[PDB]
Design a protein around this ligand. Structure first.
Ligand code: 8DG
Ligand code: MN
Ligand code: MN
Ligand code: MN
Length: 129
């Protein structure tokens, strides 16, 4: 099947809230909550991809971020490797730059069932921080 490398950014403010967007109804993992991110392209690194994806999707440039978790997940029709970057400093103010819903969500209130199932261990690990 299809095999993808995906970089996403966990955007955390100083109030323990995360900037979360919601995927379109016609997308893979439709209507799910998500960390902004996307496919790592040929000729770019995982670090470059999370910067580019956050610039495109929510209008911020991550800086001094760290790899929170890397994991693989087998969906029904595709295999992806997810790079979860913890982003605690950035230039700009995140918004729905691609017209998608986005809002700040308390970390304690996140419900893993609202996200793709691949995110389950990451959401749990974030809550222990
Ligand atoms: N963005 C994001 N994707 C996730 C998460 N968890 C998860 O399993 N995924 C999966 C859903 C998709 O199969 C894939 C992300 O690809 P995408 O749909 O964001 O692709 P993209 O933004 O590059 O799309 P495009 O603008 O290039 O057309 O990873 C997450 O927290 N954030
Ligand atoms: Mn993309
Ligand atoms: Mn995306
Ligand atoms: Mn994108």
């Amino acid at each position: 099947m299809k095999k993808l490398q995906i970089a996403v950014g966990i955007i955390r403010n100083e109030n323990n809230e995360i900037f979360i967007t919601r995927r379109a109804a016609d997308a893979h993992m439709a209507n799910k909550l998500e960390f902004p991110g996307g496919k790592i392209e040929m000729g770019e690194t995982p670090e470059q991809a999370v910067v580019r994806e956050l610039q495109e999707e929510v209008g911020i440039t991550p800086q001094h971020f760290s790899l929170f978790e890397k994991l693989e997940y087998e969906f029904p029709d595709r295999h992806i490797t997810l790079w979860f970057w913890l982003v605690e400093r950035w230039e700009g103010e995140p918004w729905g730059k691609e017209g998608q819903p986005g809002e700040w969500m308390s970390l304690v209130g996140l419900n893993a069932d609202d996200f793709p199932p691949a995110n389950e261990p990451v959401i749990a690990k974030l809550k222990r921080l």
